[model samples]
Target: ASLQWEKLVKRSPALAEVTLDAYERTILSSIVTPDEINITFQDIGGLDPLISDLHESVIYPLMMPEVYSNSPLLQAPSGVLLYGPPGCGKTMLAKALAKESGANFISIRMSSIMDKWYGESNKIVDAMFSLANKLQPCIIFIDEIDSFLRHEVTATLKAEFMTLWDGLLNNGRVMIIGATNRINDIDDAFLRRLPKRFLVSLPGSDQRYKILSVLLKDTKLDEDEFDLQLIADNTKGFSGSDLKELCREAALDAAKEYIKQKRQLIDSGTIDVNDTSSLKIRPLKTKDFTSGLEVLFQ
Candidate 1:
């Protein structure tokens, strides 16, 4: 336990190039759990169809093995590659999986080549499998996957990562998932490994409403004839992540507007500057929604 705590306190660039100790290994990988996430499939309004697939492919096969114990066809999907635009809840979807599946979710991905000629990447892959075996039923996630794999590799690292990844076929109870922005960026060899792909498109009008309902729950909007659908209608082709940010920004705008109004009231001698009355501020109005959109277009 001391080593576990101590491991996090000590680290350097010198360490990445060297072999890792047991505690160093633990400190590097993420041990995800349900408690760590507030966003579940339930919390993620909309995307029911996508959520359904996730439950069937990743969550069900691992969590409920007894149901599939007899059936030969009822197994997990080959692998998953979640591709979508930036800030579209791609990362959130992975987190929701970890929360629901009750497994250790470790995200280990490289944006580009690692440590010149893949010296350090090879080590990370080896440790990924080792830790997964120890923490059986774990998820090994790679964000912006295929970033490095697409590039042709030297003979040395090629053979090493090749064997390491192919081993996923037989590795028991360990699921590997990767996320990317462009499918075309993914190389044939890598896609040949991950067959199952899901496209996370931008949310539509109704989906935006659902997402906003979840995000602006207690964040009091102005008591006027506030209709989320109004905001939703204004926002077309907005991603789930976009909707989330929109709500946050709108709420902030409402709060700021209230502050400005209060200062005006004080200047007009209508209210005391230090009255400190109704400090809770105003609810988000439609104007706030417009303000949020302006920020987005920028």
Candidate 2:
């Protein structure tokens, strides 16, 4: 932990002045660099318009600072709220933003900040903002933010968070990216701070088709075998993650069939299990997806 503190201080000299106890050191571990984000814009399917908006609001300001430096209105919003239904690629979009922008991402896991000891959690919150300020061009991403603000210990923690957050509002190059499915449950004061709001709704048929194409790129399914357009049209209300799991179920079904065929050959003594030189899994079929659709949603 001491080693991490040394590294952080070395990277951001301003952090050296801020004293951190053992508890506060934990916040230092959540910092994610741009290069560490493997997810890119190309990896995300659909949402081209949202991507363009994010590029203007989040990416452009971070990557090219000089243009937005002179104008306050043109500067990036202090907070961005990504709210929608579950499994709609909210978290993926957040990571993609960090990957595209050369900004440090500080993912605030609730577990990391919560404490059994009284008053400690509030101090940790202070450290979080302090760490972010020194590490300018930073994004503090909080997943399921509605749950965080709705906690029992929220009154004091929320006040502390809002106060510290206001400090970073106009002066610093830091921003907060929050995601939640239940935006209505959040405090109005908290909502007021998050200026940019984008609804990450479920995928349309065209979007489902695109997401399916990206998801199946590395799989052994032949393009001619599965009618992706049919599957896309069939999946009326599925989210991006729902499509992902649907693909997994289909692949699992295909593997089961392949193994069943292989077992038959072994039982007939046509192929030796010990000396197996020709073991192969069959390519995915349209039936596999059909079975998956029935098994999953039905």
Candidate 3:
């Protein structure tokens, strides 16, 4: 199985290049010191218990499997399923795990891989697994996994794909991380294959607070300004991605205000910082942040 897959990857130039590049970039960009990914248990927010269990069951086991060999029972690296509402940090959690484990990350968007291209889609899948095997002790994240393995489509191409997937899973060094927003739509057979399944819902108030703090870390704010906790409390159902978009929009809004203020100084070739009125000034304010959040959530 491994040799055949390798030959397939070598034959397809595009698939081989993309698959190799993805893993290479992940390795090169990964932070090596501390020998773990930068994301701490707190960074995930509201998932301390999950993080703890994952560390014991998945992370530590994969990184140093032999450490726990004294016990009669042996734990094998297994597939994990992360499913819940959209934009709840499933992909982020998967990446963090990969980084912390010092494992190569191979992310495949199943929807993109399953495009109707005769046999090309299957070839891409083959190439992806092949590249992942070469980069063993890796994390293979299949985002939107339900799209291809939905209950209705299981009988079609999914059966063949599942067979290939099972083969990959049997290779203990390659870890599979599957993410799906629509858990209800996923085929039961696929779900059963995953040893661990996590439900990632929208951020609760406490989680939202952590998220806000992380997003606004570098911003200059007054000591008594911006009540981020209050803002987080108000965002009852906002996803982590939505909060990020809100923060980004706030920054862009500040930029636009700066541009607007500078619009009057077209005749002056150079920006005049001494003249307050003539200076292009777009300072990020509390109101900008508030308005941006409202625009996004409302």
Candidate 4:
């Protein structure tokens, strides 16, 4: 029954009281390593201040526990909510924190906890928190957290989960990170636990320019004709991912123009189909982006 206790104690000293059943071991399999996450603070554009604050609040305490060990005020918040519009980099920031903080990241999806069995769902919830405790300095990330409370079984599961989650506040180095687009849909009980809330709104025009520049860094653009500032100003309500998609659409439009021009040249015998060695797509044009915007709206 206690076969793996040797290495388990080395992993977490708190595991002396914790025992893992099959279900808890199942939850253990979901732990994510830092190397799996590639996003760094540098990869994110805009929200520089928010990034710094998050690093101070979330990552700092976990990295240097000795600094926060003196007082409760110095300890990090037990729960944090990154609430925002879709594609506004909430998950990206969560991943960046997970990678950079060097914490054991247990990413939970609603589907992972729900089970067809009568009482199995709540057991999984218990397992999740128990496993989190066994691995101190851990992050429990639930993306689209609002979706978890939108159903029937959520009551029992949430109550069990929150009860266990609350136990972490006494002293264990555990943090619960939630990302949700619909903050209104989450339960009041859940919200009460999450005291540190960040509203990750849509990017401004300048931020859009930065996002677009990053998205287009590798793509060849007509230097004189391509105006990113113009595009950024035109995209007022666009999210970071929307800008990325727009770039993709523009690249596709440029390729489409190239293929059509090539096809026409072949039809007229101006350039032989067999003479394709030197053929390359033209640099992207402002017209391509403009046309992409039209198609995006459609």
Predicted structure with the largest lDDT when compared to the true one: 2
Cα lDDT of model 3 by residue, 42-93, tens digit: 5787676577667765687567745544444655546788765656788778
Task: In model 4, state the lDDT of residue 133.
Answer: 67
Q: On TM-score, who's better, 1 or 4?
A: 4
Clashing pairs in 1: 221-283, 221-284, 222-283, 222-284
lDDT of 4 by residue, 183-264 (tens): 6557778888888887678778887787788777888889788888889898876765567678888889878877888888
* TM-score to true structure, per model: 0.55, 0.61, 0.51, 0.60
lDDT over C-alpha atoms for residue 211 of model 4: 74
Q: Give the TM-score of candidate 3.
A: 0.51
Q: Report the C-alpha lDDT of model 2 over 108-150, residue by residue, as the tens digit.
A: 8656457444557787778778777767778889888877756
In candidate 1, what are the lDDT values of residues 231-261, reduced to their tens digit?
A: 8898986655566667778778766878888
Ranking by lDDT: 2, 4, 1, 3
After the best TM-score superposition of candidate 1, give how far the Cα of residue 126 lies from its true spot, in angstroms.
0.9
User: How high is the CA lDDT of each candidate model?
Assistant: 0.67, 0.77, 0.64, 0.76
What is the clash count for each candidate, in the order shown? 4, 0, 1, 0
RMSD of 1: 17.9
Candidate 1 residue-wise lDDT at 14 = 38
Model 1 segments beyond 4 Å from truth? 1-29, 66-71, 111-120, 150-155, 202-298
Lowest summed lDDT across 10 adjacent residues in model 2 is found at 110-119
Q: List the pairs of residues colliding in candidate 2.
A: none
